[PDB]
Amino acid sequence: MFYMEFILSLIGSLLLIICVLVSVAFLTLLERKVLGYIQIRKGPNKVGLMGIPQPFCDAIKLFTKEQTYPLLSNYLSYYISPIFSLFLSLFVWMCMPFFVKLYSFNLGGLFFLCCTSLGVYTVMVAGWSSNSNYALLGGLRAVAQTISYEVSLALILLSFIFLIGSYNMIYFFFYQVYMWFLIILFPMALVWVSISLAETNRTPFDFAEGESELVSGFNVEYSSGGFALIFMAEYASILFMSMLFCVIFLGCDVFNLLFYMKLTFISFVFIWVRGTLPRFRYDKLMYLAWKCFLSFSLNYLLFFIGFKILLFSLL
Template sequence: MIFFYYLLLLVCVLISVAFVTLLERKVLGYIQIRKGPSKVGLFGILQPFSDAIKLFTKEQTWSFVSNFFLYFFSPVFMFFMALFLWVLMPYSVGFFDFELGFFFFLCIISLGVYPMMIAGWSSNSKYALLGSLRAVAQTISYEVSLALVLLSLMIFLGDYSLYVFIEFQTSFYLIFFFYMLSLIWIVSCLAEMNRTPFDFAEGESELVSGFNVEYSGGGFALLFLGEYSMIILMSSVTVILFFGGDLSLVFFLKVCSLVFLVLWLRGTFPRYRYDKLMNLAWKSILPFTLHCLFMYMGFKVLLE
């Protein structure tokens, strides 16, 4: 039964990813005073399915000088890592009871840099390699701040499981106590997901399309699915950490609000400069999160 539940979950995630792409195109359309997709189906509701058919039936091309085995399996591995993280979610059907759930979360997202790096390197294209190097440097830099924010929360609650966060926030949301850390968490999530204004892995003006420039058809679709499923996953984790993760319709609405925020930021903010992104990570966010970590450790020692 657990396998059936998890298979059902994966189907729901993939359908959600399809409609997140439609939502993004609609939101960007109305921000830019245009309609967005409106031809395929009623109000463009079938557009994601036509896009999926188009991508998976297009000719799969590859470079003759690429390292074919690594080049071919990098999108598959990236897609698998994005879906594998969903076993962490504390569902009422109870797939897995992770006592060290946050350490599992950090381990899996840290593995996410490898498919990006290998996809860029194995393409044997200088633009893909530069895009992958930028993506890896950015991801590693902001994973440090994500880990420090999580450590502060874990020290405060004295546990490493997502279930404890849900039980603790039945009457009090942690965002009221960790307001600044929640803002840093959201900024770090945007950088971790390579979303605007931190989408430097796909800087069209200098890198064409970043590490995925040599991919087409199904390979590009898998990279695309992995990226958008991470948006939904990070929004869900953010809700559980700071907004109370009661698995109900309210939880669904909170996740949708955060996904909408990510899409809204894409429509309103220009791309940041890469050196400023690194300065923000190492000179501003890292010292602040370290201070918060030591402060909460001190509070914990004094209270005990």
């Protein structure tokens, strides 16, 4: 009955939270192994049996490591941002689609836009709390990157949204029931990888945390426990985008293991980029954001709007 409904809804949310957290913490190893073999390294195979408990080992180190809090009175404000970031990276999951009702969450695309937007405030205030020009430059560069890409991200969404005829994500499954949707929108997939990669701040768009240009960007002044939360937040983010890529382009077959095979392959693909590409410049990226992607997205918008008008004409 009714309270059966609510109890399960909370169990599912809680159950998903532990899984996504343990997955991303455990996924970190797969980055370290996989990148280890892109390079001709062997990757972690030392601790436990073949480095399986490597990420648990990492967490124990961090939580034991003290919290080298910055200048005297910043305690809270420096302690806020990691919470307010890991929260977004997790809670963004709850809109993800199921056939087995977790929610009746409509406007899921809008909610995606919103959560992906809120990352700016976390990084920016984090740098501001740190109060170190290195951290501050990182935040500004991080802010500019995310804010710029959201513009293209929105219009890109709309192409799919029109092609499915609603904002409810679930209809991606019904429209993909015959033939996958990548093979229709191939260029969008490459662009969407880049947009997703920009959001999660991975390379080639690695300006926010980065290395060798800023020490760690905003992350530079973060002690252990805060750092662990930021680091987990980023990987919860990289997984979610991998899921969103899977549900849009590659079948949305939530009740089929092949969907989870596809999750791993896409998250692998993110790493596959990590070990291959070099980094962009500031300005060249902004050209790529406004002068290249926005034009691209508008054309497809004007292309598919006509197509659906023609489609509506036919039926």
